[PDB]
Amino acid sequence: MTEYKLVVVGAGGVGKSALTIQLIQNHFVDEYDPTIEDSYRKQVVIDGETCLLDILDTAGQEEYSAMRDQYMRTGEGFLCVFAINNTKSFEDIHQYREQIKRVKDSDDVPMVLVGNKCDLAARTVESRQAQDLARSYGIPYIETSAKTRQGVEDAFYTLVREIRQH
Ligand SMILES: Nc1nc2c(ncn2[C@@H]2O[C@H](COP(=O)(O)OP(=O)(O)NP(=O)(O)O)[C@@H](O)[C@H]2O)c(=O)[nH]1
Ligand SMILES: [Mg+2]
């Protein structure tokens, strides 16, 4: 069946794993558990199309400066996640987008910008801010909460539809 190779990238601690686990297992993991490299495969029906989502959960930590290219090279779509309460993670977004363009030798690659942790009150990254950025990249912006599950499916299905239009 149709398969979609998705990759979730972004700074450590932003909630990459929590988003992915909400999707696949429907439940919030509120604990410290740094990722090295995790892979998830689930069968789903998106807009009537039966398909297999092959998801690669990456490590936010520096030291995996090498195995970064390898996964960015085979991935068809990327969820670039930052945390709305972490300015640094938001700024690092540019850096991840560039590595993806470099590795795939392409300016337009299926991508979605994801502002996670929208359930928190202490917001340091305004929404219009992220929206302008997304607008200049020519990509969609979606705020999520792996905590309450808001916008989680939205984020993933949208990425899929972007790959579909590519
Ligand atoms: N309040 C709130 N906390 C969240 C949310 N998403 C993740 N977290 C919390 O943030 C911490 C890190 O989340 P995790 O998913 O492990 O982050 P990561 O980006 O995958 N880290 P790493 O890159 O090291 O693998 C956890 O304690 C988790 O519960 C969210 O939407 N809201
Ligand atoms: Mg993780």
Domain boundaries, the chain: 1-166
Q: Which atom in ligand 1 lies closest to the alpha carbon of residue 34? A: 24
- The CA distances from residue 90 to 86, 115, 159, in Å, are 7, 8, 19
Q: Which residue bears the tokens 């949208």?
A: 158
DSSP states along 130-163: HHHHHHHHT--EEE--TTT-TTHHHHHHHHHHHH
Q: What are φ and ψ of residue 112, in 5° steps?
A: -135, 135
What's the rounded Cα separation, in Å, for the pair 83 and 86? 5
Q: Which CATH class is domain 1-166?
A: alpha beta
Say whether 16 counts as a known binding-site residue.
Answer: yes
Closest ligand (CA of 146)? 1
- Any residues with CB less than 8 A from the CB of 47 and at least 6 apart, and which? 157, 161
User: Would the CB of 155 count as within 6 Å of ligand 1?
Assistant: no
Residue 98 burial by Cβ neighbours in a 10 Å radius (0-12, 13-18, 19+): exposed
Strand (E) or helix (H) holding 78: strand 77-83
Q: What count of other Cβ atoms lies within 10 Å of the Cβ of residue 66?
A: 7
Pair of tokens at residue 119: 């359930």
- Torsions phi, psi for 118 (to 5 deg): -60, -5
**Structure-token match 């502002």, residue found:** 115
Which of 17, 29, 118, 143 maximizes ligand 1 atoms within 8 Å of its Cβ, making it the mutation to test the pocket?
Answer: 17
31 alpha carbon to ligand 1 midpoint, in Å? 8
